Curated annotation (Swiss-Prot):
Post-translational modification: N- and O-glycosylated.
Official protein name in the record: Bile salt-activated lipase
Gene from which the chain derives: CEL
Residues shown, of full length: 22 to 553 of 753
Any single Gene Ontology cellular-component annotation: extracellular exosome
KW Membrane (keyword) present: no
GO biological process, one term: pancreatic juice secretion
Tissue expression as described in the entry: Mammary gland and pancreas. Detected in pancreatic and duodenal juice (at protein level). Expressed by eosinophils.
Length: 523
């Protein structure tokens, strides 16, 4: 009477686990390993999963999709990987009904990842329990295909790409059809995700495939407009894989069929991103990622924002988001006794600005090093390299997406945030998922303060489209973003009325969107 029991889904009955919480009757129903699509075929679109007899025991996480290990030496996962997981919070009087539903999409550069995430202190990163119970929402996590098996493409109908995006869409569609049986409101689905998962969230809101399926969305440190998201030259990367695995490269149709019958582990390990040193910046080796296929992604994403006109939207970034790519591109920023020089930074900047030639390199170098005259310290110079990568990879694309979403909004509300703290401790995921409460020995009181506020905003937003209005109190009134106010919430360990700010790095936003674009293209 206060828990779900066997749940009737379209494929048949599903039985999960009930976990009693606290002393006074609360609990949480946990389902792991519900199939939402058939066992996958290499480089083919996902298909419906056949129904089953009896009661499916949804007791354990299922295998992730076949992917390279972090050493890039071998693989793990399996072709049979399109499974999802559900947390349903339960009160002490009766079973929950009409709850907001939040669907998480993990990141990992479209190359790695699973629905449970990394395990640390006996706790999976994307364990939805804390969000679900603290926010009174349902949380869904799931697997999608990554790497070459998720995104290999010829740029044409022989191998159209975007298999992993279709996987995500199939999980969303399954949730819309089935989640009411678990106590969810299918008209109130919020997607949220980080990095590649935030770009995926963005792409799902822009795809006509999701018409009528999505109510709201949250992009964390990634949008469809980020430069690492759309592969402009997929045939080049498909040919690189073909050559490594022994497929001919003269005919696209012959190459595509050969790739489809190659050992999927060989496809997965065909290319390895060199650690160091690289000839180009890290951004250059972003390979197997979404493409404009004229189908799932019908056009350049900048042109698709009418599809999100009635999808409420949060988008934000982390203060130091670019530091991973910056550390690869300029290792000196790690070692305290190693200098970054004007010459090193010019070189990096010139790699990013090649299409506008010498002039574009200089104008960019000049604007980012303007402060180096008064402050030539290595602290300021290394911060400049990180801010540069953060701007071009995350912040500027996020600000353009916010402006595009606002300009196309009908009923949709738009919100912006900047997360500033103090894996790495500066990252937003662990606070969104409430890890400071799930493994409190690894965290300080101020961390639980931050996580409490983020879960309040996120789940208020899921419930109502208004991060300030819902089951939870918030520390700062989060004002909706407009072109006029260009406001963002700065999320930190102590928030108050001044945490609502405006015009984040607008001189740099204006440089990239007006000044740099006004420069003549060079060939
Ligand atoms: Zn199955
Ligand atoms: Zn696993
Ligand atoms: Zn297998
Ligand atoms: Zn109802
Ligand atoms: Zn569909
Ligand atoms: Zn390049
Ligand atoms: Zn170059
Ligand atoms: Zn980070
Ligand atoms: Zn992150
Ligand atoms: Zn902290
Ligand atoms: Zn207001």
């Amino acid at each position: 009477q206060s828990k779900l029991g066997a749940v009737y889904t379209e494929g048949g009955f599903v039985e999960g686990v009930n976990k009693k919480l606290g002393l006074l009757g609360d609990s949480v129903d946990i389902f792991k390993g519900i199939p939402f699509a058939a066992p996958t075929k290499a480089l083919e679109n996902p298909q419906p999963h056949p129904g089953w007899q009896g009661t499916l025991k949804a007791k354990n996480f299922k295998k992730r999709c076949l992917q390279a290990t972090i050493t890039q030496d071998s693989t793990y996962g399996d072709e049979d990987c399109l499974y999802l997981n559900i947390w349903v919070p339960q009160g002490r009087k009766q079973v929950s009904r009409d709850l907001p539903v939040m669907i998480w999409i993990y990141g990992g550069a479209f190359l790695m990842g699973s629905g449970h995430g990394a395990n640390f202190l006996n706790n999976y990163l994307y364990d939805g329990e804390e969000i679900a119970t603290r926010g009174n929402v349902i949380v869904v996590t799931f697997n999608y295909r990554v790497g070459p098996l998720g995104f290999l493409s010829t740029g044409d109908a022989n191998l159209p790409g975007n298999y992993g995006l279709r996987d995500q869409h199939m999980a969303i569609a399954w949730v819309k059809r089935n989640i009411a049986a678990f106590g969810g409101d299918p008209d109130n689905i919020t997607l949220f995700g980080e990095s590649a998962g935030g770009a995926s969230v963005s792409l799902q809101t822009l795809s006509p495939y999701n018409k009528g399926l999505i109510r709201r969305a949250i992009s964390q440190s990634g949008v469809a407009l980020s430069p690492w998201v759309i592969q402009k030259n997929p045939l080049f990367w498909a040919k690189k894989v073909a050559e490594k695995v022994g497929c001919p490269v003269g005919d696209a149709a012959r190459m595509a069929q050969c790739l489809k019958v190659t050992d999927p582990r060989a496809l997965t390990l065909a290319y390895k991103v060199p650690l160091a040193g690289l000839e180009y910046p890290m951004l250059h080796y972003v390979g197997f990622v979404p493409v404009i296929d004229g189908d799932f992604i019908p056009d350049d994403p900048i042109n698709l924002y009418a599809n999100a006109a009635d999808i409420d939207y949060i988008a934000g970034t982390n203060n130091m988001d670019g530091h991973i790519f910056a550390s690869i591109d300029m290792p000196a920023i790690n070692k305290g006794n190693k200098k970054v020089t004007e010459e090193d930074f010019y070189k990096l900047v010139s790699e990013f600005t090649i299409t506008k030639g010498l002039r574009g390199a200089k104008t960019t170098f000049d604007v980012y090093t303007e402060s180096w005259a008064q402050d030539p310290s290595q602290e300021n110079k290394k911060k400049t390299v990180v801010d540069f990568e953060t701007d071009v990879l995350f912040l500027v694309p996020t600000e353009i997406a916010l402006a595009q979403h606002r300009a196309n909004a009908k009923s949709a509300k738009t919100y912006a945030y900047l997360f500033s703290h103090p894996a790495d401790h500066a990252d937003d995921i662990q606070y969104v998922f409430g890890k400071p409460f799930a493994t409190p020995t690894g965290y300080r009181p101020q961390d639980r303060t931050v996580s409490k506020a983020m879960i309040a905003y996120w789940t208020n937003f899921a419930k109502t489209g208004d991060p300030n209005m819902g089951d939870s109190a918030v520390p700062t009134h989060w004002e909706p973003y407009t072109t006029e106010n260009s406001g963002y919430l700065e999320i930190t360990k102590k928030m108050g009325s001044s945490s609502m700010k405006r015009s984040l790095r607008t001189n740099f936003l204006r440089y990239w969107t007006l000044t740099y674009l006004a420069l003549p293209t060079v060939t």
